[PDB]
Amino acid sequence: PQITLWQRPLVTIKIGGQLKEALLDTGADDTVLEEMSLPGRWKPKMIGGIGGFIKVRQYDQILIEICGHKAIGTVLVGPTPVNIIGRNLLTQIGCTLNF
Amino acid sequence: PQITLWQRPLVTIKIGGQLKEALLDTGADDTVLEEMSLPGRWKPKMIGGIGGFIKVRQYDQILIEICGHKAIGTVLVGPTPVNIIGRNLLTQIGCTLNF
Numbered sequence: 001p002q003i004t005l006w007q008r009p010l011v012t013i014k015i016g017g018q019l020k021e022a023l024l025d026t027g028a029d030d031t032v033l034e035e036m037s038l039p040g041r042w043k044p045k046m047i048g049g050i051g052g053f054i055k056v057r058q059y060d061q062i063l064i065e066i067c068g069h070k071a072i073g074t075v076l077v078g079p080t081p082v083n084i085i086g087r088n089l090l091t092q093i094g095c096t097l098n099f
Numbered sequence: 100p101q102i103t104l105w106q107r108p109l110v111t112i113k114i115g116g117q118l119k120e121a122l123l124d125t126g127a128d129d130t131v132l133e134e135m136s137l138p139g140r141w142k143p144k145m146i147g148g149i150g151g152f153i154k155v156r157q158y159d160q161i162l163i164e165i166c167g168h169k170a171i172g173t174v175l176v177g178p179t180p181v182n183i184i185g186r187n188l189l190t191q192i193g194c195t196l197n198f
């Protein structure tokens with residue numbers, strides 16, 4: 001799809017057998033999802049955003065289906081205000097910026 | 100230009116007579132730039148991000164030339180760690196997401 005930016009670029013995703021809605025976020029290096037149950041092991045980590053930092057759990061080789069396109073890689077989980085799909089997964093689905 | 104996301108989508112902008120680099124940020128509603136000197140009168144505002152909220156100065160009808168494309172609208176100034184061009188200006192330059 002081509003997506004214009006008059007509204008938030010929210011897409012429906014499937015991760016860990018659950019369905020969520022998430023922002024296509026070119027300003028985010030990594031993918032960060034609100035607290036959710038996800039299988040397996042994780043390493044603790046801190047990521048910095050606008051207002052400061054949050055502690056997240058890092059999950060590697062996690063599968064996500066974003067608008068029907070599968071991708072696998074790193075998903076951070078913790079108290080983000082919105083689910084954010086970052087560049088780490090955006091490049092896998094072939095997402096680009098055009099003007 | 101088409102912009103792929105293997106790297107941060109950093110763009111050169113000119114605002115208030117100064118040259119900055121800013122992030123093309125689909126995940127941001129508004130444009131927020133680090134502390135810098137801008138002409139007019141501003142309004143006090145608080146915006147929320149990953150780590151919580153920051154106080155910013157709201158400036159309206161501000162001119163920015165983003166990758167040599169002119170736009171006018173709201174710019175928030177305050178302690179963001181990176182300069183971010185948000186959707187409020189991205190729509191003006193014809194910027195879209197594609198996959």
Ligand SMILES: CC(C)CN(C[C@@H](O)[C@H](Cc1ccccc1)NC(=O)O[C@H]1CO[C@H]2OCC[C@H]21)S(=O)(=O)c1ccc(C(=O)O)cc1
Pocket residue numbers: 025026027028029030031032047048049050051081082084086122124125126127128129130131146147148149180181183185
């Ligand atoms: C995260 C979400 C809440 C919206 N944010 C936009 C998002 O692209 C921000 C922009 C940003 C923030 C801090 C440092 C660099 C870039 N990126 C973002 O927070 O991403 C996170 C996770 O991935 C990481 O790489 C960048 C820093 C890390 S935001 O905090 O910057 C924001 C919030 C409110 C507004 C508003 O206009 O109200 C605008 C922008």
